[PDB]
Structures are given as C-alpha cells and as structure tokens.
Amino acid sequence: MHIPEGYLSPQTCAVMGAAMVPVLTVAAKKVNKSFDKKDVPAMAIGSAFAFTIMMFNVPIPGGTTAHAIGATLLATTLGPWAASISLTLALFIQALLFGDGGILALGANSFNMAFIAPFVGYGIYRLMLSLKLNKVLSSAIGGYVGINAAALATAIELGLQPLLFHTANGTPLYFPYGLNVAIPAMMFAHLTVAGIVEAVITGLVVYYLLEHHH
Ligand SMILES: [Co+2]
Incomplete structure (x- = not known):
C-alpha cells in the first residue's frame, strides 16, 4: 500500500x-520510559522483519500495492508505541x-x-482477548483488521486527490482515481489476500514465540 x-x-x-x-514524539517518550537497552535488539529485529515481508507485494490497478506488514505482530510483542518506531x-x-x-509521502x-x-x-487484539480468545487467534484477527484499516486510510488519501487537486478543466494533478475506484480496488486486495497473509504470518510467529521453541 x-x-x-x-x-x-x-x-x-x-x-x-x-x-x-506528534505520534513519533509520543512514541519516543513512551519507549524511553519503559524500555531498557536489553529490549532494543527486539525492536531492530522486528524492524528488519517488517521490512523484509513488505518487499513482497503485488501492484493494484486503481491503487498502489498489496503486501503484508507485520504491524500487529510487532504491536502485540513490542507494544504499539515501539511497533510505531520499528515500522x-x-x-x-x-x-x-x-x-x-515516496520520501515526501513518508508522513x-x-x-x-x-x-x-x-x-x-x-x-482489536485486546478486544478478542477480553472475549477469552487465545493470543494466537486474537493477534491474527487483529492483524487482518489492522492492515485493512491501513488500506482504507490509503485508499481514502489517494481517492481524495482528484477531488481536491485538479486543473480548472477538472484534470487530476496527482493521483487520478477517485474513492469509487481506489476504495474497492485497495479493499478487495486487502480483504481477500493481503489481510489473510498478514493474519497467518501474525498468528504463526506469535504461536512459535509463545512456544519459545516449536
Ligand atoms: Co505498501
């Protein structure tokens, strides 16, 4: 995406x-107050892991790309503030x-x-736990919902471009497809493939981590 x-x-x-x-600022303060040096390697590994899985994507006509992220995986294991920085x-x-x-598109x-x-x-993960689902399942469902919320946000940012930035003749200055295109396109890819891959990868790693072994 x-x-x-x-x-x-x-x-x-x-x-x-x-x-x-402000988010990263707050994140930075949160991590400084409750992480010690020994926990720093886990952030870096989580960071390198998310990078790796993100490199594997498929283009979406009408949108950007579809791939997994590992955002909820980092969030359940590092806490969301530290996942923020790693990601x-x-x-x-x-x-x-x-x-x-893009570089300017980094924000x-x-x-x-x-x-x-x-x-x-x-x-979402905390909610499923409060419904007494196990960590493996809750994290995987949280993963699906999380990546889809990010897809939606992306689809809405893109889709607003032709509506808000156009020539006097109505020609798009940037991304040319509206919400009618961007939302069904991005959400279909993430509801039916990327979300599942994300869920599977999240639950799997969470499972093996809890097992501390295999
Ligand atoms: Co992407």
Missing part, C-alpha cells in the same frame, strides 16, 4: 507528516535507500502502516 512520490499533493504530504510527528524505521529505509514509497505512509495498522490491530 506504500504510496509512491507524486501520488499525493505536497499539501496532503505536509498534513500527514504534521500528524505523524517507521523500516519505511524510512525503504524510501531513502530503495525508492519504495502518509507511516501514518497508515506505522500508526493506524498497529494501533487498530492492537486495539
């Missing part, structure tokens, strides 16, 4: 970045060193994948 450079207006990029700043780091490296997702992409995805996933 990574948004490439030029898909979003500079104004949209600026708003998303200004929203993402954002992965996105930073992807954009800056690999050209995957947008991290808002979707490094904020919405793990916080929705974790919230």
